[PDB]
Short mmCIF file of C-alpha atoms in Angstrom, two decimals:
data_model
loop_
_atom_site.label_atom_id
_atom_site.label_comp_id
_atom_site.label_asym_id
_atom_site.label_seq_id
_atom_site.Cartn_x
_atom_site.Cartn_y
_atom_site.Cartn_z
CA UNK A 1 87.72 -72.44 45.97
CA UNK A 2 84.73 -74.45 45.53
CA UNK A 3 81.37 -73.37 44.17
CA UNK A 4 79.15 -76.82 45.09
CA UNK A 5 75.24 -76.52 43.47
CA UNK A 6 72.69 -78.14 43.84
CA UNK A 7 70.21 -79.74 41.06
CA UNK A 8 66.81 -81.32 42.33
CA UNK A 9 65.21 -83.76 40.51
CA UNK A 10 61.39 -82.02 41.22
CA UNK A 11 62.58 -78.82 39.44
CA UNK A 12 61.02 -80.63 36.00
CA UNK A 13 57.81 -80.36 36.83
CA UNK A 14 57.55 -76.61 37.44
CA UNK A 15 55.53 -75.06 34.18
CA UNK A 16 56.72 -72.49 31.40
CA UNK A 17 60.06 -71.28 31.41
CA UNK A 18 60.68 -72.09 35.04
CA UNK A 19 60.97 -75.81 34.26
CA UNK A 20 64.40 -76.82 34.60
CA UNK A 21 66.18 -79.80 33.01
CA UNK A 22 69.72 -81.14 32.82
CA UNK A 23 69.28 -79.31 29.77
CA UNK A 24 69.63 -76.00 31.53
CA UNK A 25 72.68 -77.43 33.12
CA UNK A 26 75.87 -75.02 32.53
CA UNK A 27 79.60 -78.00 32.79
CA UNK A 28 81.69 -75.22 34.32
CA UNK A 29 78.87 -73.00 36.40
CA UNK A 30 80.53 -74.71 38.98
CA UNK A 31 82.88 -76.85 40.46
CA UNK A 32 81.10 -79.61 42.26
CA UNK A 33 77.52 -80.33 41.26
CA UNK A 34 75.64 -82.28 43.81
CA UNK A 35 72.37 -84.14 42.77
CA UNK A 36 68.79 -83.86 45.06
CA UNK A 37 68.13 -86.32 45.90
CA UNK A 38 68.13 -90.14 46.51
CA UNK A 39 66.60 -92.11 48.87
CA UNK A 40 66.51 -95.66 50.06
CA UNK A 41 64.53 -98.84 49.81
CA UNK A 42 65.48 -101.79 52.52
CA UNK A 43 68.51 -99.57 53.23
CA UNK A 44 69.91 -99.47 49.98
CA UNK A 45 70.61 -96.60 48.00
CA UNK A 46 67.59 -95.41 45.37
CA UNK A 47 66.05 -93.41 42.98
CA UNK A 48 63.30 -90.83 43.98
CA UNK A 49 62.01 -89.96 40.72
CA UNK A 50 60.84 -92.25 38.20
CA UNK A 51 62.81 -90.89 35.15
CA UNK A 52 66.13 -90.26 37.43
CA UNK A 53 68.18 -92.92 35.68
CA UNK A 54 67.59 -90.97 32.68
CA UNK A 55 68.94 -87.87 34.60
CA UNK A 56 71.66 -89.19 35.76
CA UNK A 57 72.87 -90.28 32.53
CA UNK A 58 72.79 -86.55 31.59
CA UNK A 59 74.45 -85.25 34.49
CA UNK A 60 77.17 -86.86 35.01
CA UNK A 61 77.50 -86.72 31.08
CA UNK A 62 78.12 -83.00 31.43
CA UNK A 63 81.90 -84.24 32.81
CA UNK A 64 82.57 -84.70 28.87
CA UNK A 65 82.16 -81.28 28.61
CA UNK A 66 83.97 -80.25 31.68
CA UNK A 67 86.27 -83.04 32.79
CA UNK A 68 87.63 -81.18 36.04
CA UNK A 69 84.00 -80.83 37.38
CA UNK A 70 83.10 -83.59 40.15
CA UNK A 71 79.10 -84.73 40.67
CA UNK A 72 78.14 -86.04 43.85
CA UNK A 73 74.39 -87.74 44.84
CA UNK A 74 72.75 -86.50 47.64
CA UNK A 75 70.60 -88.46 49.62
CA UNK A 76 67.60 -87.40 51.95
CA UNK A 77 66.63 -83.91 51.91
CA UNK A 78 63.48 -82.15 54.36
CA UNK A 79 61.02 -84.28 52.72
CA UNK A 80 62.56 -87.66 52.92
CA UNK A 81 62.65 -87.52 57.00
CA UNK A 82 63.96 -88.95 59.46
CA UNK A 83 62.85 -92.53 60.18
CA UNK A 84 64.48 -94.41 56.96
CA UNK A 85 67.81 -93.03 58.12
CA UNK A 86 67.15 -93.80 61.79
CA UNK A 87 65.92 -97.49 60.93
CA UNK A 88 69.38 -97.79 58.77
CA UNK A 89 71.98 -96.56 61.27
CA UNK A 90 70.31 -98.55 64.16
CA UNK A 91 72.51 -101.53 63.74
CA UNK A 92 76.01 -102.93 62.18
CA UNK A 93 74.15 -105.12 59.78
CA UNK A 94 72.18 -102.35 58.40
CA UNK A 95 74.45 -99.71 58.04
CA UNK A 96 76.94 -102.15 56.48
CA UNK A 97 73.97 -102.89 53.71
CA UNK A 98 73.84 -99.42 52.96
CA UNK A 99 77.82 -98.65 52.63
CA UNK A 100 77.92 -101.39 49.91
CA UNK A 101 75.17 -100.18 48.23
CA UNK A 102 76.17 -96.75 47.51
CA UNK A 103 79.41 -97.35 46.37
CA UNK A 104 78.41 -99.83 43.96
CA UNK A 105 75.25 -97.35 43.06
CA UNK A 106 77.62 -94.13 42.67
CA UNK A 107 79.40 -96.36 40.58
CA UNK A 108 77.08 -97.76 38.34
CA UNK A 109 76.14 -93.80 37.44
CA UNK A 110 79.19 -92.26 37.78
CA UNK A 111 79.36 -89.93 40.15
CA UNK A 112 82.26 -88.84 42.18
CA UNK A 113 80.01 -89.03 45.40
CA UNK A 114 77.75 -89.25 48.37
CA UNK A 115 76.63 -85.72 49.93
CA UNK A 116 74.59 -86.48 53.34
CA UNK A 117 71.40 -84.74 54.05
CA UNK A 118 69.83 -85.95 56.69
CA UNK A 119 67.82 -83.73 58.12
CA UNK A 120 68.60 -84.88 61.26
CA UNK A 121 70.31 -86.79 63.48
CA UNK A 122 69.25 -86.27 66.56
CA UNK A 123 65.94 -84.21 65.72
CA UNK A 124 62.44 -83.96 64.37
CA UNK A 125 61.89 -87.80 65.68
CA UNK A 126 65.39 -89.25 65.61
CA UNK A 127 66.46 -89.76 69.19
CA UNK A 128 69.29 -88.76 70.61
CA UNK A 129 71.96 -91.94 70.07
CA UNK A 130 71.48 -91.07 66.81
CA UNK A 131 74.13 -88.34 67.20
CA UNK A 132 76.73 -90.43 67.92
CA UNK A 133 75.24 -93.42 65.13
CA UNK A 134 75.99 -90.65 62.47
CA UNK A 135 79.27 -90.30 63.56
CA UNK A 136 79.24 -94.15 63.24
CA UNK A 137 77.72 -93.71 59.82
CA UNK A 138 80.30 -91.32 58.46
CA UNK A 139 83.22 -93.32 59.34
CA UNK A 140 81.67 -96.36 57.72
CA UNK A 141 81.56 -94.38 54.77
CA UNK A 142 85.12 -92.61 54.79
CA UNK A 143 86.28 -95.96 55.93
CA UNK A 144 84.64 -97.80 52.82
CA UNK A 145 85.42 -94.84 50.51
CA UNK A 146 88.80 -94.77 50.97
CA UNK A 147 89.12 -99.08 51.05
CA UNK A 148 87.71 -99.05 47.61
CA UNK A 149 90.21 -96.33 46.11
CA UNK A 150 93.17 -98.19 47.89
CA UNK A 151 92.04 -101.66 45.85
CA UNK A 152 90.35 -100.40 42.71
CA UNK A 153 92.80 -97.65 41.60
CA UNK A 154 89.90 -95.39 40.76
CA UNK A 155 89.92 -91.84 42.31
CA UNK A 156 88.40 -91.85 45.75
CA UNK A 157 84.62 -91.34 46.10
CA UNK A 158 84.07 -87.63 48.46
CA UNK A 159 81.80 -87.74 50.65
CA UNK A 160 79.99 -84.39 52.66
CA UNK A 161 77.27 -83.52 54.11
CA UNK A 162 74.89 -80.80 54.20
CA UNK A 163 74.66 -79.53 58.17
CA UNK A 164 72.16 -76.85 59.91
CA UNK A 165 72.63 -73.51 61.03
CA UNK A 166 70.44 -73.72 64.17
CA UNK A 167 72.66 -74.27 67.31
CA UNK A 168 69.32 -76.70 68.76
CA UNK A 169 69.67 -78.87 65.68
CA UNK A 170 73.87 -78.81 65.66
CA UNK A 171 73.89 -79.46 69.39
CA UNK A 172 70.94 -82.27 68.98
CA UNK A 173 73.13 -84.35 66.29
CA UNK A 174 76.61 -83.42 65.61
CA UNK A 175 79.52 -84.47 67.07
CA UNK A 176 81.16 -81.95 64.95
CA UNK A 177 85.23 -82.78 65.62
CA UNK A 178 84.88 -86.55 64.75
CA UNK A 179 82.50 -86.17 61.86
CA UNK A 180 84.64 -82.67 60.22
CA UNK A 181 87.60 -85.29 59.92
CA UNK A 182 86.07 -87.81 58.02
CA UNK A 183 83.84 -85.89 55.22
CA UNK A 184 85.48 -83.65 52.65
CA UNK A 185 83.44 -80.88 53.28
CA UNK A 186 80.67 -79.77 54.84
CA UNK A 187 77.95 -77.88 53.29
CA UNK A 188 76.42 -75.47 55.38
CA UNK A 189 73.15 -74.50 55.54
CA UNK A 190 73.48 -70.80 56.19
CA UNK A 191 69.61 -69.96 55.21
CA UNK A 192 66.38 -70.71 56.58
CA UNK A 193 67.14 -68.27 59.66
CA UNK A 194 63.98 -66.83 59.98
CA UNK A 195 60.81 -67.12 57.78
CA UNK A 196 56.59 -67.78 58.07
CA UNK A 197 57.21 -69.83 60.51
CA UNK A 198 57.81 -66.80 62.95
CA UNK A 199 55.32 -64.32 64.34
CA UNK A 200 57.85 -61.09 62.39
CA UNK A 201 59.36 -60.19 58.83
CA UNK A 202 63.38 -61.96 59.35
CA UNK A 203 65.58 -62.54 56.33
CA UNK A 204 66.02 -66.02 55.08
CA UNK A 205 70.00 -65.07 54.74
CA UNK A 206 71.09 -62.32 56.83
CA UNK A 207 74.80 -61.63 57.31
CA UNK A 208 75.16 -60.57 60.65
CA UNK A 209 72.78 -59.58 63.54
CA UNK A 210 70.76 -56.52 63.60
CA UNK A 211 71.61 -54.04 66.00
CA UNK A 212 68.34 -54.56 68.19
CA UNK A 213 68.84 -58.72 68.50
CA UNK A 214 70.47 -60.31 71.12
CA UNK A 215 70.93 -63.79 73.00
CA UNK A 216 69.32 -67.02 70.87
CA UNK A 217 68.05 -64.12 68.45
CA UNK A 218 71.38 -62.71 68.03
CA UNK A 219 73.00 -66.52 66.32
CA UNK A 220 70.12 -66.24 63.58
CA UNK A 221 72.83 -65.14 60.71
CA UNK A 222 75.50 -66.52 58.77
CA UNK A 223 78.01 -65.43 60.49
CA UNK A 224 77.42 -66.70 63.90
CA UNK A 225 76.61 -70.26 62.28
CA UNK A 226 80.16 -70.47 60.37
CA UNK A 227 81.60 -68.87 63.64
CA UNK A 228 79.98 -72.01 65.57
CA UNK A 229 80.92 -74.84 63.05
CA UNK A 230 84.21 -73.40 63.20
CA UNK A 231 84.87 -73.03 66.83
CA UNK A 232 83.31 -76.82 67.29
CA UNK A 233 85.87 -78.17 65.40
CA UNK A 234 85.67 -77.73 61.48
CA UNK A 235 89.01 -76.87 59.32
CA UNK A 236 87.71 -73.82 57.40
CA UNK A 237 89.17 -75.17 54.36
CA UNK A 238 86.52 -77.91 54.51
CA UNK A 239 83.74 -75.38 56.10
CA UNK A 240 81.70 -74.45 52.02
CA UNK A 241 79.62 -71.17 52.95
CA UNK A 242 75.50 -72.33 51.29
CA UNK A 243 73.73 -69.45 49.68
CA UNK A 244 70.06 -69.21 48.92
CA UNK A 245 69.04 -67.90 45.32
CA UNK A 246 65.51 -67.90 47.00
CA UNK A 247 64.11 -65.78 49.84
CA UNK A 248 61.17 -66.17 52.21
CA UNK A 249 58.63 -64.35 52.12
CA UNK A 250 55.50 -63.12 54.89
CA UNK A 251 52.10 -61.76 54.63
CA UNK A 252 51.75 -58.59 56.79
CA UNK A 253 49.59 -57.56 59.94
CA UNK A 254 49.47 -53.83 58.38
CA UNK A 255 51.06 -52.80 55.23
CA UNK A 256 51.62 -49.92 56.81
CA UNK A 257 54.60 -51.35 59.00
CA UNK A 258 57.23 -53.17 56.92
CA UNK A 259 60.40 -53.14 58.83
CA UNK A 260 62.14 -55.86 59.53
CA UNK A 261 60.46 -57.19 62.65
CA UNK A 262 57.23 -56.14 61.66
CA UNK A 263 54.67 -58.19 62.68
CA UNK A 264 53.53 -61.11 59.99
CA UNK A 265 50.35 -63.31 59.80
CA UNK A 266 52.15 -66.21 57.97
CA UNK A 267 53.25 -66.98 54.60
CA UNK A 268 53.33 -64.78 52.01
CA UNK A 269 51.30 -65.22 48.48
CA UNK A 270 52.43 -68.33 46.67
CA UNK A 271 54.92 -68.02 43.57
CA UNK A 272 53.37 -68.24 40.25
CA UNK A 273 56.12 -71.13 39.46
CA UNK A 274 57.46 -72.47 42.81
CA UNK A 275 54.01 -72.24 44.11
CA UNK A 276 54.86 -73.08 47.76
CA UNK A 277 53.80 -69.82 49.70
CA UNK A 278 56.38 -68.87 52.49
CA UNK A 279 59.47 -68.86 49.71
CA UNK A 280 59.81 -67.61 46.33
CA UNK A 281 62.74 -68.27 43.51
CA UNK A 282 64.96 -65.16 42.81
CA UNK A 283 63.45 -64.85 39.51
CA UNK A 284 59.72 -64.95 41.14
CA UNK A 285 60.92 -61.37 43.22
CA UNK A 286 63.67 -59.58 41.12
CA UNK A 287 60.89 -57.97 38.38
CA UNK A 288 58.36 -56.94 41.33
CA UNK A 289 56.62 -53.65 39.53
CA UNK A 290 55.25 -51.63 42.25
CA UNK A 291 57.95 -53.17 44.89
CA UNK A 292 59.80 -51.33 47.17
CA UNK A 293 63.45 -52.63 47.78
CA UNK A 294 65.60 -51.83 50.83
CA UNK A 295 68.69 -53.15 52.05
CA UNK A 296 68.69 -54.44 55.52
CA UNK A 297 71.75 -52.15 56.38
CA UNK A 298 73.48 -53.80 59.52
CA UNK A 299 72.55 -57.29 57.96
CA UNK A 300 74.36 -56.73 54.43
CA UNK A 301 70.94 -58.10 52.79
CA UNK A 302 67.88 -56.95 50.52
CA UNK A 303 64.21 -57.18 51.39
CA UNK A 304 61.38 -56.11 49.54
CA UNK A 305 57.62 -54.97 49.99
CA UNK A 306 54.62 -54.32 48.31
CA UNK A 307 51.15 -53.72 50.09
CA UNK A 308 50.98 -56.61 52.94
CA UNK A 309 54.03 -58.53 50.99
CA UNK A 310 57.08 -58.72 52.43
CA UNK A 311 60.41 -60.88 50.81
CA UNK A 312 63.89 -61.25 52.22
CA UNK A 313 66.31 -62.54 49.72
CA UNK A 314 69.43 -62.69 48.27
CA UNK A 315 70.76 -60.39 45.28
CA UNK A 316 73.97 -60.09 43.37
CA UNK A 317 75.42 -57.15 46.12
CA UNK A 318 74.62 -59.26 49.13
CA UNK A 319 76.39 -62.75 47.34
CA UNK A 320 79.30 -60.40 46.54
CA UNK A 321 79.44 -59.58 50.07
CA UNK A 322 78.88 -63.07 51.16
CA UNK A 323 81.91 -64.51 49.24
CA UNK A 324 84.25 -61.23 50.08
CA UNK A 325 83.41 -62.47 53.80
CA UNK A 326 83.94 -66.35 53.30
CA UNK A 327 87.40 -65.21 51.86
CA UNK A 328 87.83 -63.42 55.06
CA UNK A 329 87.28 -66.39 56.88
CA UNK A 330 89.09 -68.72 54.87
CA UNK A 331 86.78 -70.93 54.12
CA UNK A 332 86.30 -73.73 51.28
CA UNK A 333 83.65 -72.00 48.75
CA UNK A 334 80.20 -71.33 48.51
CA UNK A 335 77.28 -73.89 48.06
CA UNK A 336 74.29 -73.03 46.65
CA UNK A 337 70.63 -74.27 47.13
CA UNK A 338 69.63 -74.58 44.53
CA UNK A 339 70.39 -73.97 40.45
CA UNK A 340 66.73 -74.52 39.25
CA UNK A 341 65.78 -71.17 41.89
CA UNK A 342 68.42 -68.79 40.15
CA UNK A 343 66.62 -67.37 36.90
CA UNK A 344 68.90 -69.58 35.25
CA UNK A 345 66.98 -69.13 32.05
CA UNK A 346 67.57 -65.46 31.99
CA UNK A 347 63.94 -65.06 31.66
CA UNK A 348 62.84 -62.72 34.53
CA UNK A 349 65.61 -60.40 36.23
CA UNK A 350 67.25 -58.65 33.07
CA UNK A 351 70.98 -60.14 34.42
CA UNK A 352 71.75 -63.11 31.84
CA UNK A 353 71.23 -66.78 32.79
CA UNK A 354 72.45 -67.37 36.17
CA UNK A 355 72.92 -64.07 37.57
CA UNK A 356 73.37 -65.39 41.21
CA UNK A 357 75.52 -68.22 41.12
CA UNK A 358 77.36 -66.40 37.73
CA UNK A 359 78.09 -63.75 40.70
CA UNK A 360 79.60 -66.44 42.93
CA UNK A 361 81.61 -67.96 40.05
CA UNK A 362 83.13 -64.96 39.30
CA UNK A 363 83.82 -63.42 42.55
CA UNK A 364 85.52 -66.53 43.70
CA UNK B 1 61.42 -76.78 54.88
CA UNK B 2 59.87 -77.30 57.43
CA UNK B 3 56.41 -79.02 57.18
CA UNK B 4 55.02 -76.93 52.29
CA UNK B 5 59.82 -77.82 51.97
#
């Protein structure tokens, strides 16, 4: 099976013992390690960082260590937008442009390949022929990918792509039989289900329904999102299961009502490291003194409270459930977003560097 | 996600 993590090149900047550097790195953690994230400049492939040259030198140096594991670039990402990728898959000229440039850019640094993140076709000010110019996009890029293996010899670049859980967002971009053909696996986002963004407590990560949700409210879980990118055409084999080591938190109405579904006045308090309020790394809410912990029980997922804070997240029970049901379903792996928001320090949740994604590692 | 991420 596959255990694909991800590594973001911002993670360095975070203070004390939650900075994270290729240092931190762990070769056989797991399988495929997917670097966040690239951009482009006059639709060729770029840098994002200023020191990521550097970075990329050490990452894909880890393969000396472990020469089975595979490091892919990822390019895009919730920040980057939509309008560079738009501009780029808008004609035959451009898109061309940017097929050349990232094979010669992956490699120049190594890596074994291109993981799509654009977040998305289709959406948040892409319009809607960009559906079907992704689909374009990916078959330039399996197309080119497998062209260059067939003359240079070398093993075959992969190429995936990271893919939404929200029905609007699949329905709004992905023609998901045509593209599920070409890529060699798709990573899917099965987090970000419910957070500050909504007027109630949800969990970032749940399972399955509760027993109260139904209609649109009742596809808000993992399940129902594999079950859909299934069903619309993806081989499960190539279907990788993403888990959050991060969970999002809310600021209550009353700290007096805490279930899930309680009503929230936005984002909870800030992380003392992440410091983006509405989410908080699993080693910013595992050592919570004064917390109260509950397990969501018909959602197969934690949540915790104190006063008028309230955290769904992920722990080591709930990814050992997770992977027992992606086995179930017969699907690729696991992906997880992201390595720098597991206390991969072993500094915070008394479980040993990496407890989460250790977890996955081991259960799979 | 989705504006902060």
């Amino acid at each position: 099976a596959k255990l694909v993590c991800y590594f973001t090149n911002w993670a360095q900047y975070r203070q004390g013992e939650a900075r994270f550097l290729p240092k931190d790195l762990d070769p056989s953690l797991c399988t495929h390690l997917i670097y966040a994230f690239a951009g482009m400049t006059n639709h060729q492939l770029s840098t994002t960082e200023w020191n990521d040259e550097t970075l990329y030198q050490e990452f894909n140096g880890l393969k000396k260590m472990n020469p089975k594991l595979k490091t892919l670039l990822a390019i895009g990402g919730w920040n980057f937008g939509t309008q560079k990728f738009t501009d780029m898959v808008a004609t035959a000229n451009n898109r061309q442009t940017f097929v050349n440039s990232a094979i010669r850019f992956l490699r120049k640094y190594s890596f074994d390949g291109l993981d799509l993140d654009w977040e998305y076709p289709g959406s948040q000010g892409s319009p809607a022929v960009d559906k079907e110019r992704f689909t374009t996009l990916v078959q330039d890029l399996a197309n080119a990918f497998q062209q260059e293996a067939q003359t240079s010899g070398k093993e075959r670049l992969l190429l995936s792509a990271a893919v939404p859980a929200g029905q609007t967002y699949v329905d709004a971009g992905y023609e998901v039989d045509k593209i599920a053909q070409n890529l060699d696996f798709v990573n899917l986002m099965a987090y970000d289900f419910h957070g500050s963004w909504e007027k109630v407590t949800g969990h970032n990560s749940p399972l399955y329904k509760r027993q109260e949700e139904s209609g649109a409210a009742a596809s808000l879980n993992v399940d129902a999102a594999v079950q859909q990118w299934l069903q619309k055409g993806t081989p499960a084999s190539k279907l990788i299961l993403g888990m959050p080591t991060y969970g999002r938190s809310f600021t209550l109405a009353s700290s007096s009502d805490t279930r899930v579904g309680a009503p929230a006045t936005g984002s909870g308090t800030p992380g003392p490291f992440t410091k983006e309020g509405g989410m908080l790394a699993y080693y910013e809410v595992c050592s919570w003194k004064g917390a109260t912990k509950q397990r969501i029980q018909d959602q197969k997922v934690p949540y915790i409270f104190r006063d008028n804070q309230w955290v769904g997240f992920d722990d080591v029970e709930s990814f050992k459930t997770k992977v027992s049901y992606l086995k179930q379903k017969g699907l690729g792996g696991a992906m997880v977003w992201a390595l720098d928001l597991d206390d991969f320090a072993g500094f915070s949740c008394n479980q040993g560097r990496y407890p989460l994604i250790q977890t996955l590692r081991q259960e799979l | 996600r989705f504006x902060x991420x």
